[PDB]
Every structure is written in structure tokens, then in C-alpha cells.
């Protein structure tokens, strides 16, 4: 386990981290702690900082941008969302405080780094009501945001966990699609939204693990109760799919995802997820085409035999097909009976093809025009055949590198494992292990890329790790050098391990003296 020194100490537990790489070779890391946002340059040294709380503090620089104070309740600001809007380009931050409002921070050139212009408060006074708040975006219970450009407008696809206390007034809703106004004063009213019905808010809640935009859709991954009339600890994982091309939630779709250890045993609870295009080797094994986008998920049982963690692969094109087939099953032809529409937490029960709460489909109305849950689940089996054993995976980032696909897995004890993503039987193919300093705190869920390094947080620090694993020069004998994976371009120079270019006449990968 190669020791990795921290690159940045945040002064507090890192709540959120996202990166930016611009067109002009400018880049940045945005790192959020309670009450503070940090901007780092490409060398991961700080260029700027901003006070994001506490609310009703004169020193709160985001709060101050909402105009003459104060704004309440007073309280600490925990950062729930950090997202880039590349169209501007601008960072958007949204906090636990101040009704979940967001702030807009224009990116300005600063050498190879970036600096943020003074914050715009995305909350207009005369525009938000306790019963209707287009600018109430984030929930202290947690929020995922994906930004999609449609023509010359930026839309914010927002999922926010709810309960009764958060929804009472100025509620953020469950799923929404909000247009950011060009004058930076807020989001456009009239946005569309689904949320957990007040009657269900009492006992039913939804966690949002991940969100991403690929092809014509925005996808959210969720953990929630298997059923609305069921123990709120019988949890499972769902994929929610929304149109990325129209700002509408009529055809919102969910699909239950089922990963199992099957040498089988279900691992119903999603811990962390990442999607990425796969290399040719894994593509062949999954029967898809090289470079196809695959959604990878780390699952746990959520509570004897079996690994602590499994990793399942769900190719995006197959998920979309399963969903399309689910729609036809609900809405086509003669529908088979007893097929539920579902999403009872968002809408009234009904059976396909009827609209929520109804027993007939009227001729002026379309079955597909209402949200539905796909009737059968998508089941996959652990790519790693239980080989992660007792390891508790807390973070995941997948990178394609020619034919090879690598998983970079963060652990509960502060390690990174890099493993080739293949269907494994008897052993895992480790590229490299890292330790992140030696607090051994958990690796935080959210992993960012910067150039050819990945950034991971644990505790109050950010670390960088090479995507390709350690340089060839770290292999000190010929056998070791030649044991290195293909993709690294390591070859023995005679007394030295290097790339071809360091010993053009002797570089070889073939055998040892
Ligand atoms: C990166 O990180 C991984 C830590 O999770 C680590 O993986 C573990 O490595 C250890 C040491 O090799 C593995 O322990 C072996 O497991 C199998 C069990 O069948 C055995 O081959 C093996 O042989 C022996 O076990 C004997 C007991 O019968 C023991 O006395 C000997 O000492 C001998 O080791 C070990 O039991 C462990 O299973 C691996 N775990 C997992 C979850 O994969 C990697 O080594 C490390 N990789 C790199 C490239 O750095």
C-alpha cells in the first residue's frame, strides 16, 4: 500500500468536492467544508476562499449577496451541492441553510487556475412563497444535481431527500427540472416537479446516491423502501430516468436494480456508483461494443457468508432497452392484468394502462404521459465473484485506458484499491494499492478527476492519485518490471525499468537476464 501525502488540508471535514477543466488549459478544484468554500489551482494549492456561513452572520459572504440581511433561521451552512455549469462557465453551490438556495459563481481566468467572481444569490424575494419556492433547491437531508444545456438555456435536474420537517414550508421537492435565469436572479418559476406525497412523507424517504447525464437522459440512483406499505428498512436500489432533451417529467421512469453474489444472495443497497465508457476487453465480456457507457455500482447487504461489497455492471443501452420494454408492457395493446403503474410515493396507485388514481384511460389521455415503475427488476451478478471479501468500498471511479478498464475503489479504512474490471473468478487483478496518509478515515464517496490524477477526500484532506498507477521507475528489478501491466508501457532497459523513450535501443518486455 503506497503512502500518499495529503495535497490540501481543508481545515474541516470535506463536505463536497468537484473539479473543473476549461478550454484554455485552466483548471480548478472546489472543496467545501462547513461554512467555507476553497478554490484550489492545478497544483492543489489554495487561490481563494469564501465564507458560506453561518447564516445571519455578518461575515457570511454568500448570505451577504442576498442583499441587506439578515436571512434566517441562523445556523451553520453545510454544502449539499457543488456543480459546474460549463455553459457560463460558473460554479453553483447550494447549502443546508437559507431554504436550500443556491449561489452562482462566475469562473474568471487566473493563469492555469481560476478565480470566482462575487456570488449571485439565486433566490428572488418576490417570487418564492411558503407553498411554492422555485428557488428552494437543496435539502439538508441531501441533494444531487446534474446540469444539462437545452438550446441556449441551462437546466438543473435536481433530486432532494425529504421529510415532514423539511417539506413543511419552502419545500425543495423530490425530483425537479429548473431553468437557471440568464440574469442570475434565481430559477424560472413554473418548473416541473414530483415529490413524496405529504401522507407518505411521514414514513417514506429516498436517498440519492448519484446522478449523471448520458445520451438523451438524466439518470438518478436512489435507495428507498421496497414498497410504500413495508418496513422502512426493507431497502432497495432504483434507477430513475428523465428526459434530458425536454424539461418534462411526464415520462419519468424507474427501474429496480438487483446486484447479487451468486457463486444467489441479494445486495440490495447501493453504496456508490459511477458510469464510464469501457475498454474492449470488458466490452467483449459484457457483449457490448468497445467504448459503450456502463453504469457501475457498489452494493452492500445493508444487514454472514458473502463479501461485504459487490460491484455490478449495467450497460446503459441495456438499461434503456429494459425501460422501453417496461413502458410497452404497461401501455401497449392489450395490457396484461395486475401490472402496477407504481411510484405510489409520488402519485396515486393505478394499474397499467390507467393514469394514477384512475380505473380507465380516457381517449384524450396517454398512458406514457404519466410516470411509471418498470414491473421487473434488472439483476446482475458481482463482477468480482465475492473476491472483495471483507473490504468495505466507500468510493468508486472507473477509467478506460485503451483495452483495459480500471476501477479505483476507496475504502472505509482510507485506502485506494486499483483493480482491472473483468469478470473475476479466482483472484482480482490489482494494479496498485494506496493509503491516503494515515488517519485511516473513510474515503469520501465523491471522487473527481484532474488531468491524469484522481482526487479523493478523507477527513479534512484531499489527496491525488495517478490514474495509471505508479511510474515504471518504481519497479526495481527485471521480473517486477516485466510483471507490470501492459498499459503502463514498462520495459526493462538492462539495469532500470522505464518507458521505451528512456532506453530506445534496449527497452524490452520479453524476459529477464
Ligand atoms: C492490495 O490490497 C489488498 C488488501 O485488500 C491485498 O489483498 C489481500 O492480500 C493478502 C495477502 O496476499 C491476501 O491473503 C491471502 O489470501 C489467500 C487465501 O486463499 C491466500 O492465497 C494467501 O496465502 C497465505 O495464507 C496463509 C494462510 O493459509 C498465510 O499464512 C500466508 O501468510 C499466505 O499469505 C493469503 O491468505 C488476501 O486474501 C487479499 N485480499 C483480498 C480481499 O483480495 C493485496 O495484496 C494488495 N495488492 C497489491 C497489488 O498491492
Author numbering: 42 to 304, 315 to 354, 359 to 568
Q: What do the authors report?
A:
Overall, the RON Sema-PSI model contains amino acids Val42–Pro568 except for nine Sema residues encompassing the disordered thrombin cleavage site (Leu306–Gly314) and four loop residues (Asp355–Pro358). The RON Sema domain adopts the seven-bladed β-propeller fold, found in Met, semaphorins and plexin receptors. The PSI motifs of RON and Met adopt a cysteine-knot fold consisting of two small antiparallel β-sheets and four short α-helices. The interdomain contact area between the RON Sema and PSI domains embeds ∼385 Å2 surface area. In all, the alternate disulfide bonding patterns in the 1D–2A loop and the extrusion regions of RON and Met Sema domains define specificity determinants, which allow RON and Met receptors to interact exclusively with either MSP or HGF, respectively. This is the most extensive crystallographic related RON Sema-Sema interface with ∼960 Å2 embedded surface area, a rather large interface for typical crystal contacts.
Human RON (Recepteur d’Origine Nantais) receptor tyrosine kinase is the specific cell-surface receptor for Macrophage Stimulating Protein (MSP), a serum growth factor also known as the Hepatocyte Growth Factor-like protein (HGFL).
